[PDB]
Amino acid sequence: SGAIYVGNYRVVNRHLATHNDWANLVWEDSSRDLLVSSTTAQGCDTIARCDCQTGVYYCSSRRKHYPVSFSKPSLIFVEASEYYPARYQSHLMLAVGHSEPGDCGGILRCQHGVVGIVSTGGNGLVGFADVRDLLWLDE
Numbered sequence: 001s002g003a004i005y006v007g008n009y010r011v012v013n014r015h016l017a018t019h020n021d022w023a024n025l026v027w028e029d030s031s032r033d034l035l036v037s038s039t040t041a042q043g044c045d046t047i048a049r050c051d052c053q054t055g056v057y058y059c060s061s062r063r064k065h066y067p068v069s070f071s072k073p074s075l076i077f078v079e080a081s082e083y084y085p086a087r088y089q090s091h092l093m094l095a096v097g098h099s100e101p102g103d104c105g106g107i108l109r110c111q112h113g114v115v116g117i118v119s120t121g122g123n124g125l126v127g128f129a130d131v132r133d134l135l136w137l138d139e
């Protein structure tokens with residue numbers, strides 16, 4: 001679990017969005033596993049606007065942060081789950097690092113700010129949904 005709080009927005013994994021997120025929907029994209037909802041309070045986070053390919057993510061299943069090298073956002077095949085049919089997830093970045101079911105929502109950050117959130121993984125890999133291209137989050 002986990003979310004990004006920037007301005008009057010809350011960014012969460014679309015498959016983990018609550019009834020309240022859907023009632024305050026701003027934008028959602030099943031192909032990216034992202035959903036953005038509006039908030040009444042001002043958020044605590046800053047979004048990176050860069051092309052960094054190294055950073056640090058939070059891994060809830062270890063209660064620890066790990067440094068990673070990740071691939072640029074791209075279209076990657078994701079096998080069927082209880083949440084989605086088998087499909088290509090877009091804007092996804094992969095890294096070698098631990099992750100297990102329950103780790104979605106952990107933040108990935110570089111020196112410029114928030115880069116993305118954990119969205120898939122397995123077998124010693126971790127996949128992150130990028131948010132750096134969502135320029136409208138800053139207004």
Ligand SMILES: NC(=O)[C@H]1CCCN(C(=O)Cc2ncc3ccc(Br)cn23)C1
Binds near residue numbers: 078083089101122
């Ligand atoms: N983005 C998606 O389609 C995910 C939706 C929830 C379901 N998806 C998964 O990957 C579930 C899953 N099985 C093994 C692992 C290991 C690490 C992580 Br993080 C998640 N994991 C796929």
Ligand SMILES: [Zn+2]
Binds near residue numbers: 049052
């Ligand atoms: Zn950066």
